[PDB]
Structure 1
Amino acid sequence: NPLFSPYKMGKFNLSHRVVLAPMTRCRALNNIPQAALGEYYEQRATAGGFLITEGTMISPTSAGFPHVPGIFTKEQVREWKKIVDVVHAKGAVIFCQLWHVGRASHEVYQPAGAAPISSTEKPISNRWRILMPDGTHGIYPKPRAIGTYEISQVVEDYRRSALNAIEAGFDGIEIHGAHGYLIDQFLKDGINDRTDEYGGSLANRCKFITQVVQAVVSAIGADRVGVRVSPAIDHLDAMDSNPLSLGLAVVERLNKIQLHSGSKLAYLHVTQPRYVGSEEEEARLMRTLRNAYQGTFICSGGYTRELGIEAVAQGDADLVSYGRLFISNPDLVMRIKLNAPLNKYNRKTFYTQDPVVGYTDYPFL
Structure 2
Amino acid sequence: NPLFSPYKMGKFNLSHRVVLAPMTRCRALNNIPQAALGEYYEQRATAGGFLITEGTMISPTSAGFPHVPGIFTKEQVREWKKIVDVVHAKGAVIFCQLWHVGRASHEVYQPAGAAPISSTEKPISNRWRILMPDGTHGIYPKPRAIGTYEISQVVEDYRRSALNAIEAGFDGIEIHGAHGYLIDQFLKDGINDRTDEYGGSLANRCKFITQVVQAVVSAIGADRVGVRVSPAIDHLDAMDSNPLSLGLAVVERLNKIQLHSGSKLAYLHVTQPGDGSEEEEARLMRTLRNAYQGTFICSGGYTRELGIEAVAQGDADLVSYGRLFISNPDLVMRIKLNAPLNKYNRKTFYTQDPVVGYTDYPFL
Offset at 1:4? 0.5
3-state DSSP class of the match of 2:287?
Answer: helix
Q: Deviations over 1:240-275 (max 9, x none)?
A: 0000000000000000000001000000000012xx
> C-alpha root-mean-square deviation of aligned residues, in Å?
0.6
- Once the two structures are superposed, residues 313-361 of structure 1 have per-residue CA deviations (whole angstroms, 9 ceiling, x without a partner) of 1100000000000000000000000000101000000000000000000
CA drift of 1:179 comes to: 0.2
Aligned to 1:278: 277
What is the CA distance between 1:165 and its match in structure 2? 0.0
Q: How does 1:164-313 map to 2 (within 5 A)?
A: 164-273=164-273, 278-313=277-312
Q: Following the alignment from structure 1 to structure 2, what is the Cα–Cα distance between the partners of residues 307 and 139?
A: 37
How much does 1:76 deviate? Answer: 0.2
Q: CA deviation at 1:102?
A: 0.2
- Aligned residue for 2:135? 135
**1:259-302 CA-partner distances (Å, limit 9, x unpaired):** 001000000000012xxx92111101100100000000000000
1:320 aligns with 2:309: no
1:27 deviates by 0.1
Q: Deviations over 1:116-166 (max 9, x none)?
A: 000000000010000000000000000000000000000000000000000
Per the alignment, in what secondary structure is the counterpart of residue 82 of structure 2? helix
Distance 2:217 2:15 in 1: 26
How far apart are residue 101 of structure 1 and its match?
Answer: 0.1
The answer to whether structure 1 residue 154 and structure 2 residue 154 are counterparts is yes
| TM-score for both structures, normalised by structure 1 | 0.99
Distance 1:96 1:338 in 2: 29
State the alpha-carbon separation in 1 of the partners of residues 135 and 272 from structure 2: 28
Which SS does the other structure have where 2:133 is aligned? Answer: coil
* Offset at residue 42 of structure 1 (A): 0.1
Q: Distance in 1 between matches of 2:112 and 2:90?
A: 41
Shift of 1:64: 0.1
Q: 2: CA distance between counterparts of 1:158 and 1:330?
A: 30
In the alignment, the residues of structure 1 paired with residue 160 and residue 308 of structure 2 have an alpha-carbon distance, to the nearest angstrom, of 38
Length-normalised TM-score, structure 2: 0.99
Task: Tell me the SS of whatever aligns to 2:236.
Answer: helix
Q: Secondary structure at the match of 1:320?
A: strand
Shift of 1:217: 0.4
Structure 1 spans left out of the alignment, 5+ residues: none
Displacement after TM superposition at 1:55 (Å): 0.1
3-state DSSP class of the match of 2:293?
coil
Q: Deviations over 1:203-253 (max 9, x none)?
A: 000000000000000000001000000000000000000000000000000
2:199 & 2:278 partners in 1: Cα distance?
31
Q: In the TM superposition, what is the alpha-carbon distance from 1:183 to its structure 2 partner? A: 0.1
Please state how far the C-alpha of 1:33 moved relative to its aligned partner: 0.1
Distance 2:281 2:339 in 1: 28
**Partner Cα separation in structure 2 for residue 264 and residue 20 of structure 1:** 22
1:331 paired with 2:330, answer yes
Which runs of 5 or more structure 2 residues have no equivalent in the other structure? none
Q: Distance in 2 between matches of 1:240 and 1:278?
A: 17
- SS of the equivalent of 1:326 reads helix
Partners of 1:192 and 1:51 in 2: how far apart? 32
Q: In structure 2, what is the Cα distance between the partners aligned to 1:303 and 1:68?
A: 26
Q: Secondary structure of 1:81's partner?
A: helix
State the distance in 1 between where 2:253 and 2:53 align. Answer: 25
Three-state SS of the structure 2 residue aligned to 1:363 is coil
Q: Distance in 2 between matches of 1:141 and 1:346?
A: 29
Does the residue aligned with 2:75 lie in a helix, a strand or coil? helix
Alignment partners' CA distance in 1, 2:82 and 2:12? 21
Q: Tell me the secondary structure at the aligned position of residue 62 of structure 1.
A: coil
Deviations 1:22-54 (A, max 9, x none): 000000000000000000000000000000000
Which stretches of structure 1, 4 residues or more, deviate above 2 A after TM superposition? none
Q: Using the TM superposition, give the Cα deviation of residue 11 of structure 1 relative to its aligned residue in structure 2, in angstroms.
A: 1.2
Match of 2:44 in 1: 44
Q: CA deviation at 1:66?
A: 0.1
CA distance in 1, matches of 2:212, 2:13: 27
Q: Distance in 1 between matches of 2:96 and 2:106?
A: 24
3-state SS, counterpart of residue 8 of structure 1: strand
Distance in 2 (CA, whole Å) between partners of 1:104 and 1:12 is 34
Partners of 2:42 and 2:329 in 1: how far apart?
A: 9
Post-superposition offset of 1:12: 1.1
The structural deviation recorded for 1:202 is 0.2
Tell me the distance in 2 between the aligned counterparts of 1:86 and 1:250. Answer: 35
CA distance in 2: counterparts of 1:42 and 1:77, whole angstroms: 18
